[PDB]
Amino acid sequence: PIVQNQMVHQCISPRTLNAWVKVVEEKAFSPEVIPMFSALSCGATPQDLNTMLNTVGGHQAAMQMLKETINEEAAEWDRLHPVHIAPGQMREPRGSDIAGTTSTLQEQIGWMTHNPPIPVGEIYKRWIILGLNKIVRMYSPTSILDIRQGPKEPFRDYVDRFYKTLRAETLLVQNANPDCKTILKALGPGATLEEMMTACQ
Amino acid sequence: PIVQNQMVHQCISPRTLNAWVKVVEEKAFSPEVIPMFSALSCGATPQDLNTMLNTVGGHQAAMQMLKETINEEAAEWDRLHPVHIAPGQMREPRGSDIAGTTSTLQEQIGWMTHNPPIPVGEIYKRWIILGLNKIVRMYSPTSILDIRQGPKEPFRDYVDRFYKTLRAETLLVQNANPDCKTILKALGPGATLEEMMTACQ
Amino acid sequence: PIVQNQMVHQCISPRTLNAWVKVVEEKAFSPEVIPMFSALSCGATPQDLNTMLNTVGGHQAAMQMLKETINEEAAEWDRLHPVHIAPGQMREPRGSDIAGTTSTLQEQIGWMTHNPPIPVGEIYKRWIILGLNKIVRMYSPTSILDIRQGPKEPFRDYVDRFYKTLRAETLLVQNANPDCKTILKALGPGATLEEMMTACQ
Amino acid sequence: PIVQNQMVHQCISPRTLNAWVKVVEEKAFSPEVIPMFSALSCGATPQDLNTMLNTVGGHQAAMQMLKETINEEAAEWDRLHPVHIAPGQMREPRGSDIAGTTSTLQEQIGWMTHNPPIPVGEIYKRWIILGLNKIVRMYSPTSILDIRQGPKEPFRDYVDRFYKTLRAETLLVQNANPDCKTILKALGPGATLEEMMTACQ
Amino acid sequence: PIVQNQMVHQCISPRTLNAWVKVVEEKAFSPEVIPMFSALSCGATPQDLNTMLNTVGGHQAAMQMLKETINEEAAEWDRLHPVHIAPGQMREPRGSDIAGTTSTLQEQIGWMTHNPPIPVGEIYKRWIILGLNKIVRMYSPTSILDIRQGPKEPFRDYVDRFYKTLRAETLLVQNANPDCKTILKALGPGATLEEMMTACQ
Amino acid sequence: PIVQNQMVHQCISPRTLNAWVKVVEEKAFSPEVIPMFSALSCGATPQDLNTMLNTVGGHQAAMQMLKETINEEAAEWDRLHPVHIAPGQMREPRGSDIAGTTSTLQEQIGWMTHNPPIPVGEIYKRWIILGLNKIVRMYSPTSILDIRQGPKEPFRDYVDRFYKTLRAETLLVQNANPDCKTILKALGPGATLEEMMTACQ
């Protein structure tokens, strides 16, 4: 990553490397892996971002899809920012430079610490999360339409499933079981979630 | 977080990230999770606070309720502090800025390190703990009225349950078993907890 | 805590937070938990001390007793140091300020780093350990009078139990078994512990 | 490694040492071990690189092959950069110097921190990864030609295997099972991977 | 401990605290615990040394014996260095000051960082190791006279036991079994251990 | 160890201490323990080196042999560098000084940071590794002559054993099984290891 000492490059830590690999092993593409990815990649160069992605051993279908999305964003970057070098001067980054496949670490450091800064690490991270979100959506196992409260399922457990599904991807009341539904309907309009859960507790 | 070097931004640590996720996995919304949250979020920006909340994978009912409380505090903030920008100057934060959904990290850093400082991290944390407390209360499994000493339950174990329940949510003596109750009644008024526990030991 | 960089505030560490919670989970109120508490709270502000106590999830009877002792010391502090503020100036701390319930972190930092320093962290820690010691004493399971060497119990194991009990709360010889007692009596006056243990080895 | 303080030598960490040894124990020569190796060897001197390789206890066939590749690159280096010393002056590195077998740490530090820098750590790392890639290829257990979707194998699981094999080492559709193949064929030309996987989901 | 920044006090680490407690739990008073103690107490003040000893929960017989030895060394210190204070000046340390029971941390820091330094941490550590060595000796389970090679015991295993016993507390050959003894006797005078072990391998 | 801040002494870390003790517990004297020892002792003083050796609890036969080798190197040092002190001046180190048994830490620091430096830590480490190598050789369980490919043993597994044995201590082809041997013989002269392994794969 790049962090302050002056902004300077620091080696990615074994702790960071292991944390990412483990989250993926343990959580796959559950939605909460994305915020973890973003935090673990705080201050990351494109090189660092590639390191994190490349250290993943499984899920190679997903990792290929991600490359596809990345290449799509890089092409759109090239469409909006065509590049044209002068001895000793900073060149303009193209898509594959931001994605760290045709740029060196030193070039990335130069862009990231220039004045004004060209935040290639942040730009690349945005593309990666765009791709990751597609994957989270794809690997979501259930439709919100199929999340319905069971006959003796605690309302809390049902709401947990409902919003967990919504995150991966009136209905709450509709999909509630008969007993709870009657209670919720009587609540009247404008009830908060807290109120509904207390009601069916 | 923001910490001294001068106050500067530091990336949230893998240790901090894991600690929070693990406490929630292991303790759910037992009351002692709140002090842990506050300590783990020492010096946190709103971005950091969102990271911590968002990295939680389960309990999505609770996490939705929390969003509700947060939006309520943000609206009250907007009611008390309407915002009106000048080139190069600091804008005033609105509710959603303090909650980190419409403000950038750099803006948050600017507010937090301004003179005088606008402690958006501390303001947001207060809202979050307000919401968390509601959840702790909701998920409290038992009424203090239902905590009564068992026939052969050690007084100490009963007092543990009693104050554990009180924390999540004369009575102590009333709910004690007959044998202990007689002892405690004879103690007379003004007895400390230490005295009562020694008495029924 | 407060530590040198100049004395400055540092966030309490996840390592420190976990260590304390784990010692309590694993050792309860065995006497050796107190020295651990004191060391883990090296340089602690009152806020930090409250964090450590509050992160404990079990033993709520004990934690209530501790609050009682703390309030007693705070009242005695107020009796000896009545407080009377001038714009921009440091106010005098009352009991509840030292206990961190009515003082802010910044006020605590101000007191702790003033010249001369008002060591509110050290004063509060003394009160807490006073209360903790009462609890260790209360939860001590056995009287030293009931620690007697078994017929075929190794002398070393008996001495371990004896001094372990003494810590939680002539007698050594008296409570020794017949065979060892005869040996020890013949040792004559003034024998060290090392000498007694070698003798009955 | 060499890192900034000025560039200075830092001892390789126990964390780094253990991480590498463990990845090899746990993952052998699966392709994702290479990006991990490169990241764990961030800033490494040739001495550090040798340390990492030499701390591996198993896989001695592979480690011998790696030495072979290294010696081949060192010979080609010597062919392109013949060396010819002046009292107090920096000598030119030969192949075995870059590979750290005939150069001292101080010499390596001198080369790496000279102006202009002679990046012997980076040059050696390139040779090592060249050799490691050969090994990954050798230890790849299956031909991409033998990766075919099973009768009731989820398309996602099949694509995972396919790209995992491709990494170690039209075909995707050809090797898909009859049911999925029909769907994919109807998709028409130009379908992305995301589209194919959704189609056969 | 005291370490350089200038020599300054640093809080004892949770890592250090746990390491010591664990070694004692896992190894008791095996001889190798002493070098570990000395290393873990690198730079320790007397306060730190007391912390380490006091955090031990078991072995209270041993811990009492240690106090006895410590008091004996402190008395001999007082015999050789009688103490006689001037406003603002450093007082001379007595035995119990070096042992940290009647001296404050600030006094210990003052002594340890004075010019010339009065190394109270090192002096106390010497006393503690003197006491620990007595305990290692006491808890040594076997006499070197009872370490004899078994009929089919590998010579290496026998030598391991022999020198392990010697550490806790011609003979090597004498106690070897008949077959090995014959070989060793034929070796002639002056044979190294390596030679003997190779011979009976 | 000694490291830069200026070169200064740093306490050996609990992480380093534990890593070494664990490697020995887990790997005994397998050859890869030596590179680990050298890396973990980066920057070590003789005191540190003794700490590492002395913290080992088992293998006391080996540890005695090591002392023997160390004393032999120290005697040869004394033969080549006889020592002859001037008030305030640095004395010359003898063998036992380099081995840290008759020199203080401060003396070791003085030698190691003098200009020109007298690298007593590096000199001692060389002696220790000389002794360790003897032990690795001694504890090697099998002769390379007894490493022969089994009838249905994969060539790769056989080569692993062969070079693992060679490390602890034409033949490769000779010791290969009949089927593989025929293939290898037909390969002709000059075949690399990679080529042989591919051939018999």
From Swiss-Prot, chains A, B, C, D, E, F:
Highest taxon above the source species: Viruses
Post-translational modification: Phosphorylated possibly by host MAPK1; this phosphorylation is necessary for Pin1-mediated virion uncoating.
Location(s), subcellular: Virion
Segments for region (Interaction with human PPIA/CYPA and NUP153): 54-89
Region Dimerization/Multimerization of capsid protein p24, annotated ranges: 139-201
Residues that bear Phosphoserine: 13
Assembly and oligomerization: Homodimer; the homodimer further multimerizes as homohexamers or homopentamers. Interacts with human PPIA/CYPA; This interaction stabilizes the capsid. Interacts with human NUP153. Interacts with host PDZD8; this interaction stabilizes the capsid. Interacts with monkey TRIM5; this interaction destabilizes the capsid.
Stated role: Forms the conical core that encapsulates the genomic RNA-nucleocapsid complex in the virion. Most core are conical, with only 7% tubular. The core is constituted by capsid protein hexamer subunits. The core is disassembled soon after virion entry. Host restriction factors such as TRIM5-alpha or TRIMCyp bind retroviral capsids and cause premature capsid disassembly, leading to blocks in reverse transcription. Capsid restriction by TRIM5 is one of the factors which restricts HIV-1 to the human species. Host PIN1 apparently facilitates the virion uncoating.
Name the record gives this protein: Capsid protein p24
